[PDB]
Amino acid sequence: HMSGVEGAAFQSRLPHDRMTSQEAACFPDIISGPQQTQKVFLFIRNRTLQLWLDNPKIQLTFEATLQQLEAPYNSDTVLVHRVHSYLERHGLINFGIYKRIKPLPTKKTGKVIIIGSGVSGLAAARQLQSFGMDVTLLEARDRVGGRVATFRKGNYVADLGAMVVTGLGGNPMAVVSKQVNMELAKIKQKCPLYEANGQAVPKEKDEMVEQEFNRLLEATSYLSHQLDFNVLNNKPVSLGQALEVVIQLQEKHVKDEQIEHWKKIVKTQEELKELLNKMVNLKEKIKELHQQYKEASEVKPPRDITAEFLVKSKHRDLTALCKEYDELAETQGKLEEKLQELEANPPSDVYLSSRDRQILDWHFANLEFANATPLSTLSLKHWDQDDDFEFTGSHLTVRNGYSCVPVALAEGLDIKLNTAVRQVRYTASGCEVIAVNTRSTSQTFIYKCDAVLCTLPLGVLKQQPPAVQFVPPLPEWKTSAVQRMGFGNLNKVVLCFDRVFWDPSVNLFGHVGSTTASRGELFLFWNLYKAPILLALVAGEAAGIMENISDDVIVGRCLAILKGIFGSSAVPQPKETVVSRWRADPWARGSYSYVAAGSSGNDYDLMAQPITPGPSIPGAPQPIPRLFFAGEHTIRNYPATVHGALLSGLREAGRIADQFLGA
Amino acid sequence: KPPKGMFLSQEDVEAVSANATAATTVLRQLDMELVSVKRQIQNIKQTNSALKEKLDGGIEPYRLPEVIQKCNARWTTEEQLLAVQAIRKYGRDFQAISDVIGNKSVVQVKNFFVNYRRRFNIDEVLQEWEA
Amino acid sequence: PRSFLVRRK
Numbered sequence: 001h002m003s004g005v006e007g008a009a010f011q012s013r014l015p016h017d018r019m020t021s022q023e024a025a026c027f028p029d030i031i032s033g034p035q036q037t038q039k040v041f042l043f044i045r046n047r048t049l050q051l052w053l054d055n056p057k058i059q060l061t062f063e064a065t066l067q068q069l070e071a072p073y074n075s076d077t078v079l080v081h082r083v084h085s086y087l088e089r090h091g092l093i094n095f096g097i098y099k100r101i102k103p104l105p106t107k108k109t110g111k112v113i114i115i116g117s118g119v120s121g122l123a124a125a126r127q128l129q130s131f132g133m134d135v136t137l138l139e140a141r142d143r144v145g146g147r148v149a150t151f152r153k154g155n156y157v158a159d160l161g162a163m164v165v166t167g168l169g170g171n172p173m174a175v176v177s178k179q180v181n182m183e184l185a186k187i188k189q190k191c192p193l194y195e196a197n198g199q200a201v202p203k204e205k206d207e208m209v210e211q212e213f214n215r216l217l218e219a220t221s222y223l224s225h226q227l228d229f230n231v232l233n234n235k236p237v238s239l240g241q242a243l244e245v246v247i248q249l250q251e252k253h254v255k256d257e258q259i260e261h262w263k264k265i266v267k268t269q270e271e272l273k274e275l276l277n278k279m280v281n282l283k284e285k286i287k288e289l290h291q292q293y294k295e296a297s298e299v300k301p302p303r304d305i306t307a308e309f310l311v312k313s314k315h316r317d318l319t320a321l322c323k324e325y326d327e328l329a330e331t332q333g334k335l336e337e338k339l340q341e342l343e344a345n346p347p348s349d350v351y352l353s354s355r356d357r358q359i360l361d362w363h364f365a366n367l368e369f370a371n372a373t374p375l376s377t378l379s380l381k382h383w384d385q386d387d388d389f390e391f392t393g394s395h396l397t398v399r400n401g402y403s404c405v406p407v408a409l410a411e412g413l414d415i416k417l418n419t420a421v422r423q424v425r426y427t428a429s430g431c432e433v434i435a436v437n438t439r440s441t442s443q444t445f446i447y448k449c450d451a452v453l454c455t456l457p458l459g460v461l462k463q464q465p466p467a468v469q470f471v472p473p474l475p476e477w478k479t480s481a482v483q484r485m486g487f488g489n490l491n492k493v494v495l496c497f498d499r500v501f502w503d504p505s506v507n508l509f510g511h512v513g514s515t516t517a518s519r520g521e522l523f524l525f526w527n528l529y530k531a532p533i534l535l536a537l538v539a540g541e542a543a544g545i546m547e548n549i550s551d552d553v554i555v556g557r558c559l560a561i562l563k564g565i566f567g568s569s570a571v572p573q574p575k576e577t578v579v580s581r582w583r584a585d586p587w588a589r590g591s592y593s594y595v596a597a598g599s600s601g602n603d604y605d606l607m608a609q610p611i612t613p614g615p616s617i618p619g620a621p622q623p624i625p626r627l628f629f630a631g632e633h634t635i636r637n638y639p640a641t642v643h644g645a646l647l648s649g650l651r652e653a654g655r656i657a658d659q660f661l662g663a
Numbered sequence: 664k665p666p667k668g669m670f671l672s673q674e675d676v677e678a679v680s681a682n683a684t685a686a687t688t689v690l691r692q693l694d695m696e697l698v699s700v701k702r703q704i705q706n707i708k709q710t711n712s713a714l715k716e717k718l719d720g721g722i723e724p725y726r727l728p729e730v731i732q733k734c735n736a737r738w739t740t741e742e743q744l745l746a747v748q749a750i751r752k753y754g755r756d757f758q759a760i761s762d763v764i765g766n767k768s769v770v771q772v773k774n775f776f777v778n779y780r781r782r783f784n785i786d787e788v789l790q791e792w793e794a
Numbered sequence: 795p796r797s798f799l800v801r802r803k
């Protein structure tokens with residue numbers, strides 16, 4: 001993304017120097033043919049994208065495209081038309097909110113019902129309407145945006161749903177942010193921790209625990225990919241299981257290390273013992289031999305030569321033994337030095353202290369927040385399967401509130417709010433969607449359409465007994481995917497005060513939980529809003545449990561933790577408080593998808609696959625597909641995100657248009 | 664391939680995962696092994712304290728002053744008789760025999776053996792030392 | 795997913 005044309009390819013999540021699978025399908029003549037024609041194709045594509053991206057507030061037409069192409073790229077008018085049409089159809093250009101050069105024809109082809117007015121639903125609806133289809137969105141809630149929900153009272157603004165743009169580098173919300181007035185503000189990465197008591201973690205310790213966390217994660221990846229530790233007792237290995245195992249092996253090594261150290265101390269002590277014994281025996285033989293010499297020397301001259309020899313021989317023998325003992329006394333000295341050195345440099349007493357395991361649990365809580373699930377549920381092998389598609393650049397927050405995006409997308413769309421879909425019927429001839437008014441449930445509605453786009457959250461599709469009945473029932477391959485896949489939970493506590501008592505230069509600050517069981521409970525506080533608002537996350541096992549506890553108690557536990565960090569005099573009572581309960585929300589049944597143990601990226605593709613009904617009269621030709629699926633749980637490469645939802649909508653609009661208007 | 668500061672043996676992984684309590688079992692086995700090695704230290708270092716006590720004073724009371732006698736060439740009858748007795752006690756150890764006499768190099772002692780072999784029946788004297 | 799992690803290494 002250094003060049004201008006190459007930068008557009010990157011911003012559109014396309015390889016600038018190669019044709020994609022989708023391109024091979026729509027341009028088989030080109031990709032199967034000479035290299036020169038492919039390079040021409042790739043430039044026309046890359047350039048068209050550049051033009052759209054440079055000004056995404058107005059429709060890029062085919063004519064406007066052909067104008068600004070230099071030869072020999074503008075030579076082939078049909079190739080330029082095919083490229084433009086492909087890009088428009090698949091929502092790579094002329095997506096979001098742009099001024100249209102030519103008004104849409106009042107004559108509409110085909111009828112589509114879209115279930116849900118979330119970003120996936122709205123993204124699809126806009127595309128389909130702009131392709132000249134008749135679109136109606138059915139929405140259970142009294143509002144649009146779905147899991148994008150912004151709280152508003154006076155000047156107070158706080159997202160209870162999606163909050164963060166995870167970088168603009170390759171992000172389609174980059175285009176939407178130019179089209180819609182979003183106040184995008186960078187998140188300052190500095191995040192001080194504060195232990196149970198309210199004391200900031202010592203800098204050196206903080207750095208040590210964090211480094212151990214990242215090593216523990218990398219270890220699970222090694223455990224997974226290198227040692228192939230992915231099944232245990234005919235059950236898929238959790239990330240939690242792998243972390244437990246990796247920790248236990250680190251605790252084992254600490255003990256194994258101590259043993260080897262003490263084992264070489266006893267081996268030196270048993271050398272010293274064997275020496276000291278030899279020196280004690282030799283001292284007795286020296287003592288005895290000295291007496292014998294003393295007695296022989298006491299015999300005064302004159303004496304015969306045998307008496308002289310006895311004095312001399314004993315003197316010789318005593319000097320020889322006094323040499324041995326002095327050599328052993330040296331050997332004793334160096335073994336005593338070695339022993340004092342081993343006692344001075346012992347190995348680690350413990351792998352992790354009680355406080356270190358507590359601070360480490362915060363990093364696990366952070367990971368449980370990110371995946372919106374207990375680490376015991378995450379697939380070790382595939383929890384991070386979308387890593388290669390992550391965007392580049394600083395993460396940003398929406399200061400004016402994320403709702404600004406769906407509300408903007410909803411302009412000019414036929415949206416039935418307070419309309420809860422109960423039954424989806426799909427046959428060879430078409431579809432009936434049976435909904436009710438959420439207020440008076442007896443007021444029944446029937447919508448007849450050529451196609452149904454289902455953007456129901458995975459939480460709703462999972463609900464047993466079902467909130468929505470499919471007739472005929474969804475195939476085993478679809479329902480198995482729904483059952484297998486993870487749908488997580490993550491809650492937010494909005495605290496609105498009259499004055500700022502926290503560090504305005506710090507956007508993020510954590511609280512370390514007392515125990516492992518409570519590590520997710522109000523583990524993080526967010527300060528990214530203009531007004532004095534603090535947003536507390538409830539992650540991990542804590543999320544599900546804290547939904548069965550009153551807002552007062554939760555606001556209670558919040559103030560307690562803040563008092564601990566800032567002191568009782570600094571923390572006032574909050575003016576306004578909100579507590580999200582996403583698992584209990586019957587139009588969500590959770591926060592967003594995770595790759596559950598026993599699932600993979602492949603299930604996200606199964607979720608995206610449309611249903612084709614059986615024939616009406618039998619021996620009748622294979623019907624066309626009727627029931628289509630979009631939403632964050634349908635996009636393998638960008639799951640559990642707003643950009644994922646948006647991209648999933650654009651994808652299904654193109655698949656539906658291709659089907660019912662022709663490619 | 665594992666990260667620095669992490670130890671992950673295939674063998675170790677199998678042993679920890681083999682059972683649900685295998686890990687907590689393997690860790691107590693090492694805790695007991697560590698106590699057993701730590702008490703074996705206390706024992707053998709208190710044993711070594713007792714021996715260091717029995718050697719208190721060294722061998723300074725039994726140390727004999729050093730003789731610095733100048734090496735001489737002429738064999739006195741005294742020196743010849745000392746040598747013959749030294750041969751009988753110390754066998755063929757020429758250094759020891761030289762030490763006893765105290766004014767004959769290892770060379771002169773080595774010569775002496777060949778010179779006087781006949782006159783002092785050194786063959787017989789060595790046979791007597793061997794038996 | 796990973797993307798949402800705070801204090802990313």
Ligand SMILES: Cc1cc2nc3c(=O)[nH]c(=O)nc-3n(C[C@H](O)[C@H](O)[C@H](O)COP(=O)(O)OP(=O)(O)OC[C@H]3O[C@@H](n4cnc5c(N)ncnc54)[C@H](O)[C@@H]3O)c2cc1C
Nearest residue numbers: 116118120140146147162163164421587591631632641642
């Ligand atoms: C707490 C939280 C924080 C998040 N943070 C981020 C973040 O920082 N960044 C990010 O990119 N993503 C984030 N996400 C994820 C993001 O909100 C979703 O991935 C995305 O909004 C999903 O859009 P969707 O259209 O797939 O589903 P939804 O937005 O849920 O849309 C589905 C719609 O279907 C409707 N519906 C349900 N049942 C029925 C029915 N029976 N009949 C009719 N309509 C029905 C719902 O009311 C809803 O409007 C977060 C999610 C949560 C919960």
